[PDB]
Nucleic acid binder design. Sequence first.
RNA 1: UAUGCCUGGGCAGGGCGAAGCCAGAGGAAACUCUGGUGGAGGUCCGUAGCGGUCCUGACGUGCAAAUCGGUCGUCCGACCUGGGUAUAGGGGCGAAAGACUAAUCGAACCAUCUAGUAGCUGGUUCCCUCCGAAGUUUCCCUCAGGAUAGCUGGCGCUCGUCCGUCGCAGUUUUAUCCGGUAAAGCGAAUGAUUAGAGGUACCUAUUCUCAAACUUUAAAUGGGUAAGAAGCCCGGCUCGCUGGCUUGGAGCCGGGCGUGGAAUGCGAGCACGCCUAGUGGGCCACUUUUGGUAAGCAGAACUGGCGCUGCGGGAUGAACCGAACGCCGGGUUAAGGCGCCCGAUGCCGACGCUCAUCAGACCCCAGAAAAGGUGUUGGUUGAUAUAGACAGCGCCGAAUCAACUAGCCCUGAAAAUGGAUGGCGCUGGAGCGUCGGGCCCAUACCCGGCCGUCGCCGGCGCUGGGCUAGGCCGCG
RNA 2: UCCAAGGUGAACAGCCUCUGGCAUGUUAGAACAAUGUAGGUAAGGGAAGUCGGCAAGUCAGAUCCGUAACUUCGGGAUAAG
RNA 3: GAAGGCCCGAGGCGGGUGUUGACGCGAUGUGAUUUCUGCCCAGUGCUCUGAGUCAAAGUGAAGAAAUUCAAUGAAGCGCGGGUAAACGGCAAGGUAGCCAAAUGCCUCGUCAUCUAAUUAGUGACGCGCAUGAAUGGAUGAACGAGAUUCCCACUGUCCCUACCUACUAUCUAGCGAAACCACAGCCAAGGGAACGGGCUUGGCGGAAUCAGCGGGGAA
RNA 4: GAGUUUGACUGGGGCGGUACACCUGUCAAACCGUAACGCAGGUGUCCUAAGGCGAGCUCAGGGAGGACAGAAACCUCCCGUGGAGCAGAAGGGCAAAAGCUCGCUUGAUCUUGAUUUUCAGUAUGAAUACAGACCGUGAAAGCGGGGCCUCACGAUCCUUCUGACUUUUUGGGUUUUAAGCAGGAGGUGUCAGAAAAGUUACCACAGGGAUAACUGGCUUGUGGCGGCCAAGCGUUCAUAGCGACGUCGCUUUUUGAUCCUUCGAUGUCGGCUCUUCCUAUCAUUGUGAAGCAGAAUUCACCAAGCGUUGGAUUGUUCACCCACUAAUAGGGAACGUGAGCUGGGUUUAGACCGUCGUGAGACAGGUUAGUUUUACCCUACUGAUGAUGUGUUGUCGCAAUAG
RNA 5: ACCAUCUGUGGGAUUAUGACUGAACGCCUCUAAGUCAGAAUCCCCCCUAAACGUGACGAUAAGCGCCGCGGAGCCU
RNA 6: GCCUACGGCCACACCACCCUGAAAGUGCCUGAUCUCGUCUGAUCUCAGAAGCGAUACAGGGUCGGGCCUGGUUAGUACCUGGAUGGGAGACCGCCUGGGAAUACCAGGUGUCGUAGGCU
Lengths: 63, 202
Amino acid sequence: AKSKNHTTHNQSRKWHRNGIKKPKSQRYESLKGVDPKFMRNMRFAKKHNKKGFKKMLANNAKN
Amino acid sequence: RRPARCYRYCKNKPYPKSRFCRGVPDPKIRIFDLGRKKAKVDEFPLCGHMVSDEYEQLSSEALEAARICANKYMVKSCGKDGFHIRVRLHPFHVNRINKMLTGMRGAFGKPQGTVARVNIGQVIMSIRTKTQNKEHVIEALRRAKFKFPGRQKIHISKKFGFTKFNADIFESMLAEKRLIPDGCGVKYIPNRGPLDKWRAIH
RNA sequence: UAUGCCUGGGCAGGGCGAAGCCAGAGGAAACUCUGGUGGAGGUCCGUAGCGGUCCUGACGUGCAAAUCGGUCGUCCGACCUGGGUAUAGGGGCGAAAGACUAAUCGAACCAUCUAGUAGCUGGUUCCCUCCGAAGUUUCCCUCAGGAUAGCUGGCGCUCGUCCGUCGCAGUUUUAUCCGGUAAAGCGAAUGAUUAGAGGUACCUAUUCUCAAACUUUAAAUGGGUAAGAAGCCCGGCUCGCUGGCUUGGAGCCGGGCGUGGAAUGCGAGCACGCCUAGUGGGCCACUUUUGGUAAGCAGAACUGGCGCUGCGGGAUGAACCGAACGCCGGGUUAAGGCGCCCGAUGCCGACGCUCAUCAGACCCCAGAAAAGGUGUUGGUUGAUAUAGACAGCGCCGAAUCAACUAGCCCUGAAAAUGGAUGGCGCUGGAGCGUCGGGCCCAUACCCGGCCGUCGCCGGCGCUGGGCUAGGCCGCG
RNA sequence: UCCAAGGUGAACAGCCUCUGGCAUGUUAGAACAAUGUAGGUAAGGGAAGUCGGCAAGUCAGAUCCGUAACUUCGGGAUAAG
RNA sequence: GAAGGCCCGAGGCGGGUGUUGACGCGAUGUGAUUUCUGCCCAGUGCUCUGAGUCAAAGUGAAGAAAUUCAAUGAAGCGCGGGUAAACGGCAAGGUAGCCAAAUGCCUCGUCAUCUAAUUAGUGACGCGCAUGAAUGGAUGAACGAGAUUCCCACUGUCCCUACCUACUAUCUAGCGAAACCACAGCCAAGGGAACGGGCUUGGCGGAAUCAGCGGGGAA
RNA sequence: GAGUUUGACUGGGGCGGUACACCUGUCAAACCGUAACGCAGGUGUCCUAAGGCGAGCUCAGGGAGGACAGAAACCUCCCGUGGAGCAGAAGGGCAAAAGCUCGCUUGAUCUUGAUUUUCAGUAUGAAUACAGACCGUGAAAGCGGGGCCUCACGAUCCUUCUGACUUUUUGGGUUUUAAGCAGGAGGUGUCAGAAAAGUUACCACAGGGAUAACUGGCUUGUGGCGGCCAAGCGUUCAUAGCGACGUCGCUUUUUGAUCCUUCGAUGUCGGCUCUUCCUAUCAUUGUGAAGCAGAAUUCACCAAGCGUUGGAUUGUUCACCCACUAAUAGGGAACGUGAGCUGGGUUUAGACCGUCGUGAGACAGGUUAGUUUUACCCUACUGAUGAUGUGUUGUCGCAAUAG
RNA sequence: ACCAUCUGUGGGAUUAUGACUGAACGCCUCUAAGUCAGAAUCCCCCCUAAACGUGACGAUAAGCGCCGCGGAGCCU
RNA sequence: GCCUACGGCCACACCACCCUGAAAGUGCCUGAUCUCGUCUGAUCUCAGAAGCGAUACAGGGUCGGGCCUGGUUAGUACCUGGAUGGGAGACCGCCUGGGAAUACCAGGUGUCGUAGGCU
Ligand SMILES: [Mg+2]
Ligand SMILES: [Mg+2]
Ligand SMILES: [Mg+2]
Ligand SMILES: [Mg+2]
Ligand SMILES: [Mg+2]
Ligand SMILES: [Mg+2]
Ligand SMILES: [Mg+2]
Ligand SMILES: [Mg+2]
Ligand SMILES: [Mg+2]
Ligand SMILES: [Mg+2]
Ligand SMILES: [Mg+2]
Ligand SMILES: [Mg+2]
Ligand SMILES: [Mg+2]
Ligand SMILES: [Mg+2]
Ligand SMILES: [Mg+2]
Ligand SMILES: [Mg+2]
Ligand SMILES: [Mg+2]
Ligand SMILES: [Mg+2]
Ligand SMILES: [Mg+2]
Ligand SMILES: [Mg+2]
Ligand SMILES: [Mg+2]
Ligand SMILES: [Mg+2]
Ligand SMILES: [Mg+2]
Ligand SMILES: [Mg+2]
Ligand SMILES: [Mg+2]
Ligand SMILES: [Mg+2]
Ligand SMILES: [Mg+2]
Ligand SMILES: [Mg+2]
Ligand SMILES: [Mg+2]
Ligand SMILES: [Mg+2]
Ligand SMILES: [Mg+2]
Ligand SMILES: [Mg+2]
Ligand SMILES: [Mg+2]
Ligand SMILES: [Mg+2]
Ligand SMILES: [Mg+2]
Ligand SMILES: [Mg+2]
Ligand SMILES: [Mg+2]
Ligand SMILES: [Mg+2]
Ligand SMILES: [Mg+2]
Ligand SMILES: [Mg+2]
Ligand SMILES: [Mg+2]
Ligand SMILES: [Mg+2]
Ligand SMILES: [Mg+2]
Ligand SMILES: [Mg+2]
Ligand SMILES: [Mg+2]
Ligand SMILES: [Mg+2]
Ligand SMILES: [Mg+2]
Ligand SMILES: [Mg+2]
Ligand SMILES: [Mg+2]
Ligand SMILES: [Mg+2]
Ligand SMILES: [Mg+2]
Ligand SMILES: [Mg+2]
Ligand SMILES: [Mg+2]
Ligand SMILES: [Mg+2]
Ligand SMILES: [Mg+2]
Ligand SMILES: [Mg+2]
Ligand SMILES: [Mg+2]
Ligand SMILES: [Mg+2]
Ligand SMILES: [Mg+2]
Ligand SMILES: [Mg+2]
């Protein structure tokens, strides 16, 4: 009472039945798996980014 | 053995005698050159081939039988030393045979014989001899066609003997020291080597 | 019914004839012999009785859920039998056949637990509209089954919905990568392998033939990415990271710049949301491809198809060719056809090929090969000839001969109920090849009507008719 | 389970009759084909049939004779003829 | 040897054998007589002895105690002996016998006999695939609804069928079921789920029926 | 005595094998992926270094040399792209390396998360790239949290060990004990992980043509049959008759392969009986050929009209033998023919023997005894009435067609 | 009841094959056109059956058959 | 023209042999006290400057091998898609596009960057 072992015959039709969908490209992709030492300093760059907010307003006025 | 109708078509990949295909028996054909092999190139100018027309497998049994059928006629019609037959098909493809039949459980068979895969337009057997023996080669190669399956046609090559140069240019290249005979064939001498070899020739 | 016990009943006529006994004989004696008598026995023939051999007879929806006939076993014995008692279900009883224990026995019968369970069969009840599969992935004491992923449907929701811009693609183009298959190569590596030659069994230079688990090379098809505003440009800010030094790097802020920065088509998004049925036996074909002598064999890749699908054509037939389907009218076609069956050549069709005492007659596809022919028709390469050939007996007086190849036909070609270009039949073709014009009809295509569904950033609360707006109307 | 006539015969065998009982066994008439079931015969040959003398047939009572191989001495034995 | 063997039984001062007592009861094997009954105690099993393992309880020790440890340490096992008319084998290597057998694969063994002819039968031969001695060997009168071979006799078993009789069948009067049944019922070929009755192409097809028949309906 | 179990895959099943968890090359058709009881192999290990780092060194082999010393001992030089070695199978990688040798060592340590591969994108196993500690090594740059890369391994529950702490031990406190958290190990090889011997012919149920045995169908290896070529045989002479080495077919009367039909059943071996069919003709009819003088025989052709027998043995088809004969040819029809027969074989239950198993039992080993059911239905065939339309009816004929 | 006895049959076209004439192909040739012989095969006669086939002919009942385009009408 | 140190590409650079080489540089070369390392100052590390271009190194040469590039083989082999194309088959042709690789022949044979230095 043997049967069939492996088949990929009708699988291409099933895959394209709803179409092969790529993940929607999102701005600001996820930062998972990045260097932890790099992520530490990048958090500190955003943590103290408001410290130079007064210099930003002064330099924008020169333009 | 089984009839050649069972192993006539090139149905499988080439299965040579290698470290993986062990236990292969010895082929039926062992001698491929007959007649006066150690003859000069000028001895046998004319050459005739047995060109195939099928993409099939010629058994080593049929290669040996057609070798004898062609040799026994060139000896009787051109003498024992007036020709040089060269069989240009070595049986390398091994045939497999299943056991004397639990039926197909483990059906991969053991080696049975050896065939030579021939192509459409490939030479099977070549005979070189004198020019006046042209009709004898055609008949010798015709009698050996019945020892082969499929369809074969007899062709008289334009080359000079077993060489790869045309007969019209062969005389000119000999005078210009571009071809020198070494036994059954000739060596092509280009002008792209050390000049010391050129001085040795002249 | 099996067996023990208790109390009763019954068992013709004959055969051989045992111990005991009587008498007469023989003998020197011991002892022997003969005749008769007697009536023993799990004795013999055999009736009743009890059994049930053979005919494998009759019957075999019977007379009968085991009987009938002939034949046959035994019939003083471990014999036959009634009645009364004993042993009760994993028990009884058994001269032992798993026999028998109420037509039930390798574990009776009855009721209940019990509507026991079943991955296994069978069946599963009105109409219509719309959408529409899977036999594949992983796991499972799984492989007739589930879980899971895929395919399905429903419910929506977030937006877009003139150009424009987002966004999208089983497709090209441009740009740039990836690969080691076909082919090729081995006078290159590994491996295999043929023949000579040269120099002195090797050694050098050549040569023949090969690889799927070899390769210097190397496609076609194919795979990945990119083709902008999430950009470019200018000027600053943050950092604890980086450090010869704003030196990097990344983040952030302000300002400026559409020619949207390939073609084409197209509405998208929500981990293609949320819940989700069915399926998880597939099968077939072109090409590729594995085992196998091969298979309407087994096993894969890719795409289509069948299954789930009718329709025209192949006589016919799940898969082939064409084409997919609401109900109709007209027209036109596809594949395939147009002697008749049978719609259409009832054309003054074209050119040839072919005679078959088994002719031949078209995808899948439903019988042929090697090898032959001085059948016929083409073609190729040669050779003789008007200083006279070929053939026939010098005569003759114009071409002839050989080999090879290719069409059709023929030989090769033998199976069993009578039979299959589908049939009839067809030979100035209804045969084969090359074509032309015309013609025939599919649920395909075009136009038109009607029905329904779906889509309209649809229309109408501004009334003769109208607006049961859950209605009416329009368009595709 | 009980009672059990006459003849034949060794016999409660088989066959015939008397006493007693019955109406042919859940139907009848006509016909006399095949094929059956049951019964019987068959020339000449005699198991050639068939897995196989299956079935059938031969033999049979009594009287007078004659009775082996073998044997556990009992038998075999109604040997056989 | 009864305070027992064997067995029943849920249970007792239970019950059977047993109203018994070794010439008895219980459990097995072999299977009259005659004739023999060989070898192996390793394995398995039974049985018989007194020098490692060994439960609970009990004793000892440590600890607040639970607990832990130690010593002691039944039967049985282990060790040892016996036992094969115990299972078995031939630790022992099949002895006496027997056989191509109801047992022999090769095999229709070889030889003789039995027939014109014999895979049968019988008598022999035996490295016997894979015989064999109370898992009994060999023989054997009498007996057998046992298996088998031959001969005589007999016969319709047969050559080769025929005829006769009785009851049926058959016909009539009366009476009167059942199995079965998608629809049904002439074929050939083709295709098809690869053996159609129906579809395809042909052959063709004429009411209603009787007695038969056993090809088909994959009855 | 009771209860239960006695894996799965599988060209039926069992036996065998493990294709059951893994790895290499190939298959695989140039991304990846891709099956079969496809092909060739490997695995349940090994290593305190064969891990890590630094330094120096260069291998296999060959040539020429050098006391013993030789085809192989050791020394020297030269050539040497690796032709060596790198624990193992294979592939890949590798030369002042990853090999060899040497001296310092324990990055084979303590942690968090992410990622890759098999993937459902779960787990395990095995990998990748960081980060925070603590170290090794080198002058240093660096390199190293196992082996140059691709294999070399294991859930819950339970036990055991290590570690940590405002952790519990239940009305509080102390000490034992127990429990918990976290990290290892003890193992499930059927390797995502039940706790598992048979036998059944005395068998039972659910089913299955998903699946065997019997026919048919495809296939023709095998079997049977027939060509082609012509070495040779035929005293000589290849083809009268033959046909080696080769090669092309045919047949479905062998067997095998396959598993498409049938397991809510197609009665299954042979014989008997009986009809028809095929020809690959044994005989007869008419011919051709010879190594045909006659006779006998052989080969071949038209050809299946006619015939192909009686017996011993065996259940046997198949063989063998006896005779007879013109010849004693070969086959099909569901291996024709069981509501036709016969049950001999086979093929239930009884029983014996041999071998086998401790046993129940098994044996396509032998032997003996073993229920063969139903037609009256439809066609078919055999005969029998009758039906047919020309007015009724009768006699005498014709004759298609079939045999 | 071969266990007695009686009867069992004629042609036609041709197969194989052997030939005639005669080309192709000045010859030759069974073949190409045209002819001959030719068989247990084939067809037919003989023989058995007799069709939704039939011919000749006889007899055909107050009913019935022929003959008056009977002479007019009703259903199909 | 040239040489060093560090290199990028990694044979057009390599290999064999031959010829030539200013100046500096490089190398050879000369020693072993110290540093350091060997069986041995050969190698390695250190110290040094009498000697030359021998070799290394660089340049050039060879009808050089190899390598590189191109041609040729060749629109050949192979191949996408298509047909009711051919053929008993094996296979082959055509349509639509794509398109190789040996032998053979020719040409070429290092180049670039940083820094310092010599004619
Ligand atoms: Mg499956
Ligand atoms: Mg599998
Ligand atoms: Mg007696
Ligand atoms: Mg009696
Ligand atoms: Mg009876
Ligand atoms: Mg009976
Ligand atoms: Mg009956
Ligand atoms: Mg008796
Ligand atoms: Mg009683
Ligand atoms: Mg009970
Ligand atoms: Mg029994
Ligand atoms: Mg619909
Ligand atoms: Mg599907
Ligand atoms: Mg099912
Ligand atoms: Mg689902
Ligand atoms: Mg599911
Ligand atoms: Mg299923
Ligand atoms: Mg397949
Ligand atoms: Mg299958
Ligand atoms: Mg289905
Ligand atoms: Mg569909
Ligand atoms: Mg057709
Ligand atoms: Mg229309
Ligand atoms: Mg038509
Ligand atoms: Mg011939
Ligand atoms: Mg033909
Ligand atoms: Mg329209
Ligand atoms: Mg009566
Ligand atoms: Mg008689
Ligand atoms: Mg007989
Ligand atoms: Mg009898
Ligand atoms: Mg006697
Ligand atoms: Mg005993
Ligand atoms: Mg013992
Ligand atoms: Mg003996
Ligand atoms: Mg006999
Ligand atoms: Mg005997
Ligand atoms: Mg004994
Ligand atoms: Mg008896
Ligand atoms: Mg039917
Ligand atoms: Mg039936
Ligand atoms: Mg059970
Ligand atoms: Mg299984
Ligand atoms: Mg791949
Ligand atoms: Mg770290
Ligand atoms: Mg099936
Ligand atoms: Mg064969
Ligand atoms: Mg041969
Ligand atoms: Mg014939
Ligand atoms: Mg007989
Ligand atoms: Mg049969
Ligand atoms: Mg029948
Ligand atoms: Mg029957
Ligand atoms: Mg039968
Ligand atoms: Mg029997
Ligand atoms: Mg039996
Ligand atoms: Mg003729
Ligand atoms: Mg004539
Ligand atoms: Mg060069
Ligand atoms: Mg090139």
